[PDB]
Amino acid sequence: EVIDFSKPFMSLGISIMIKGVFSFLDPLAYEIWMCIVFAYIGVSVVLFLVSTNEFGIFNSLWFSLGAFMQPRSLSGRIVGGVWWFFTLIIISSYTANLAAFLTVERP
Amino acid sequence: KYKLTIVGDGKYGARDADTKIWNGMVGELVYGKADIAIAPLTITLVREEVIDFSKPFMSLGISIMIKPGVFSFLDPLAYEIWMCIVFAYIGVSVVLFLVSTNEFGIFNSLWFSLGAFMQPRSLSGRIVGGVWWFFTLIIISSYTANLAAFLTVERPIESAEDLSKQTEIAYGTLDSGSTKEFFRRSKIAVFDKMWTYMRSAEPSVFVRTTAEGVARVRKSKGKYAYLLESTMNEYIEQRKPCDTMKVGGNLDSKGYGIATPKGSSLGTPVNLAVLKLSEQGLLDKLKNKWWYDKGECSNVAGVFYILVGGLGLAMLVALIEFCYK
Amino acid sequence: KGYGIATPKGSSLGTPVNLAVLKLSEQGLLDKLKNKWWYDKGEC
Numbered sequence A: 001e002v003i004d005f006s007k008p009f010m011s012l013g014i015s016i017m018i019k020g021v022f023s024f025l026d027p028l029a030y031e032i033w034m035c036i037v038f039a040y041i042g043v044s045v046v047l048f049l050v051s052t053n054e055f056g057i058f059n060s061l062w063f064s065l066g067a068f069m070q071p072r073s074l075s076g077r078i079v080g081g082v083w084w085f086f087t088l089i090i091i092s093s094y095t096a097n098l099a100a101f102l103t104v105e106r107p
Numbered sequence B: 001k002y003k004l005t006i007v008g009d010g011k012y013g014a015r016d017a018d019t020k021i022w023n024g025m026v027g028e029l030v031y032g033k034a035d036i037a038i039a040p041l042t043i044t045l046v047r048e049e050v051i052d053f054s055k056p057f058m059s060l061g062i063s064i065m066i067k068p069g070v071f072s073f074l075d076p077l078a079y080e081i082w083m084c085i086v087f088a089y090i091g092v093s094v095v096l097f098l099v100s101t102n103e104f105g106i107f108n109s110l111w112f113s114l115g116a117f118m119q120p121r122s123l124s125g126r127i128v129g130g131v132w133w134f135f136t137l138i139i140i141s142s143y144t145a146n147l148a149a150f151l152t153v154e155r156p157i158e159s160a161e162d163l164s165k166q167t168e169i170a171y172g173t174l175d176s177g178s179t180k181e182f183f184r185r186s187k188i189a190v191f192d193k194m195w196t197y198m199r200s201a202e203p204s205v206f207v208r209t210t211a212e213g214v215a216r217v218r219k220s221k222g223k224y225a226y227l228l229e230s231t232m233n234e235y236i237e238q239r240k241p242c243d244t245m246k247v248g249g250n251l252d253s254k255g256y257g258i259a260t261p262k263g264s265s266l267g268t269p270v271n272l273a274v275l276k277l278s279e280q281g282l283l284d285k286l287k288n289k290w291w292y293d294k295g296e297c298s299n300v301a302g303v304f305y306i307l308v309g310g311l312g313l314a315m316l317v318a319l320i321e322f323c324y325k
Numbered sequence C: 001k002g003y004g005i006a007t008p009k010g011s012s013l014g015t016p017v018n019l020a021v022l023k024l025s026e027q028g029l030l031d032k033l034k035n036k037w038w039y040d041k042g043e044c
């Protein structure tokens, strides 16, 4: 109103300026941590059916200890083997993926 | 009061070199056909000489537009390798089976198969368990290492400099317009190389119309990028099937404005009006109204199924055992 | 928003400077200058 302005020689505006345990939850997806836990209790319950109310509690706590990871009852035997092969793949995937992350490393 | 009228030839404002005649809206202004031009008219030097442009009511520029399988688990470790690791698997459970009447061999074969399903000092079968362990150790290490390279390499077109640094993804502009003429005349480092590429790129990276360009981006599976005005781009992103997006900031700074005949009475008034509208956020509001508001826009699993399958197989072997007993 | 060259109301340099700014931008001279002081002369 008081002076004259030539056409803009530089267009701008208001911007945002910025500067995490969440780098551990990323490698293995939240969805995957969930399913690995569902299948976790999904095996400790299957084993629980292999072996009165308290007798089921002591056993459910024993199969949960057989769950918390580390005779020849073929039934539950292949369960422990397959579950082992399952966790083997997962921990291998986590390790491999985390390495990619530590190589490239690109809110 | 005003009467909205569409320009005859349907052009913006150019100047034929020969006849030296203005066409489109800019033309209808110079020849007294209209009193004012309210449209996406770019504020250019060639036009500012013949007509008057109010302050920009919308700043823009040139932008960039871009667009499971359980078999990713069978790849790391080759099908041939999964086979041999299984042949050697039973190849060890049979060797151990020879270490330890018909049923006694079945119960043992199931025990050595449990010693197989992986985790006294009989030296014979002892070194077998050790060598087999060293064998599986190498394999699982190989699988892990190999799976990492596929994820490391697995780890987008962000800026314009990214289009010049690579060649895998082709890109072009409109065969005719300020967009194309921009790169041609641009003396800037990055934009220079880009033009050099597009100038001799085969097949033609230039399209006839804007619709053709968008179609090329939607049908190239992300192999072709299209350069166009940010304004039109942002709008396209808000149109079905919502398969296009603008990436990075603009390449240059432009702006539309209200055009009024040189030395007009509406000159100053309209100019201030535009400034007033922008400060009241009315301009930003209008854009939001028509652009966004009115807008219309695995691997681990495969190992889970093989697990449940194993559980089911066991639940089957369990039932039969109780039956025989 | 946007910055601009300010000249006293009804000045002689008015129109000339206005066109000059438009000319500089079209020649990419403005973009060049910014790159010179922001990124080129930058430390990062």
Ligand SMILES: O=c1[nH]c2cc(C(F)(F)F)c(N3CCOCC3)cc2n(CP(=O)(O)O)c1=O
Pocket: B012, B013, B040, B041, B042, B043, B176, B177, B178, B179, B210, B228, B229, B231, B232
């Ligand atoms: O004053 C001008 N204003 C313009 C405004 C627009 C739009 F963004 F659509 F509003 C466009 N398009 C951009 C996308 O492709 C289709 C049409 C072209 C314009 N042109 C032609 P240029 O010579 O190529 O710049 C002018 O001259």
